[PDB]
Curated annotation (Swiss-Prot):
Gene: Trim21
Residues of the full protein shown: 291 to 468 of 470
Induction / repression: Up-regulated by IFN.
Designated name of the protein: E3 ubiquitin-protein ligase TRIM21
UniProt subunit comment: Homotrimer. Component of a SCF(SKP2)-like complex containing CUL1, SKP1, TRIM21 and SKP2. Interacts with CALR, CUL1, FBXW11, HSPA5, IKBKB, IRF3, SKP1 and VCP. Interacts with SKP2; the interaction with SKP2 does not depend on an intact F-box domain. Interacts (via N-terminus and C-terminus) with DCP2 (via N-terminus and C-terminus). Interacts (via C-terminus) with IRF8 (via C-terminus). Interacts with ULK1, BECN1 and with ATG8 family members, including GABARAP, GABARAPL1, GABARAPL2 and MAP1LC3C/LC3C. Interacts with TRIM21 and SQSTM1/sequestosome 1. Interacts with IRF3.
Locations listed in the record: Cytoplasm; Cytoplasmic vesicle, Autophagosome; Nucleus; Cytoplasm, P-body
Domain notes: The coiled-coil is necessary for the cytoplasmic localization. The RING-type zinc finger is necessary for ubiquitination and for the IRF3-driven interferon beta promoter activity. Interacts with SKP2 and CUL1 in a RING finger-independent manner. The RING-type zinc finger is necessary for ubiquitination of NMI.
Function summary: E3 ubiquitin-protein ligase whose activity is dependent on E2 enzymes, UBE2D1, UBE2D2, UBE2E1 and UBE2E2. Forms a ubiquitin ligase complex in cooperation with the E2 UBE2D2 that is used not only for the ubiquitination of USP4 and IKBKB but also for its self-ubiquitination. Component of cullin-RING-based SCF (SKP1-CUL1-F-box protein) E3 ubiquitin-protein ligase complexes such as SCF(SKP2)-like complexes. A TRIM21-containing SCF(SKP2)-like complex is shown to mediate ubiquitination of CDKN1B ('Thr-187' phosphorylated-form), thereby promoting its degradation by the proteasome.
Post-translational modification: Autoubiquitinated; does not lead to its proteasomal degradation. Deubiquitinated by USP4; leading to its stabilization. Autoubiquitinated.
Family designation: Belongs to the TRIM/RBCC family.
Length: 185
């Protein structure tokens, strides 16, 4: 792909994070803590899952960023509406305002309803995410496999400002402690 020139500098928004997440001082890395991280509750925080939003809001244009997922067993990545539900149980679907892919139990799937199987021959260590707001497109790229396409959501109905979306996943196994990292431009 030739989307690299739309690169944007994404930072994480502390105030949206699940209370067990640890966001680095530079706001470029997030990981699961082993306990509550001693922050107050607020209506922005994701309560049920280890999720956080980027600070940036997008309502036009073309945007591209990359995320490092090295040695993780589970994660979700993509974009979501600024107004997604924060509290309680919900599925990641375009109907609920999410355009995402994930890794879970050794398989990759796109967050459609119902979910779609992805065909990845080279497990990615870094994922590229491209958003074209006007075209209604969200695309995912395998940076480890020379930028190969993973998945395209098309005919997206964003219906609001978009935020970068992250889930570091649960660490019940002891094998998913590694962080998500925003990779340099
Ligand atoms: C994020 C919501 O908190 C929990 O469900 C509690 N806990 C699950 C197992 S874990 O992922 O090892 C650490 C967090």
């Amino acid at each position: 792909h030739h989307h690299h020139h739309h690169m944007v500098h994404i930072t994480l928004d502390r105030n949206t994070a699940n209370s067990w997440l640890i966001i680095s001082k530079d706001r470029r890395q997030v990981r699961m803590g082993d306990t509550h991280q001693n922050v107050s509750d607020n209506k922005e925080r994701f309560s049920n899952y280890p999720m956080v939003l980027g600070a940036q809001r997008f309502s036009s244009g073309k945007m591209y960023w990359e995320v490092d997922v090295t040695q993780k067993e589970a994660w979700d990545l993509g974009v979501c509406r600024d107004s997604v539900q924060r509290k309680g149980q919900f599925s990641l679907s375009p109907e609920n305002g999410f355009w995402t892919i994930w890794l879970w139990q050794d398989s990759y799937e796109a967050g459609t309803s119902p979910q779609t199987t992805l065909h990845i021959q080279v497990p990615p260590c870094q994922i590229g995410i491209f958003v074209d707001y006007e075209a209604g497109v969200v695309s995912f790229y395998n940076i480890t496999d020379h930028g190969s396409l993973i998945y395209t959501f098309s005919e997206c109905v964003f219906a609001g400002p978009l935020r970068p979306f992250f889930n570091v996943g649960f660490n019940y196994s002891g094998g998913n402690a590694a962080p998500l990292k925003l990779c340099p431009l």
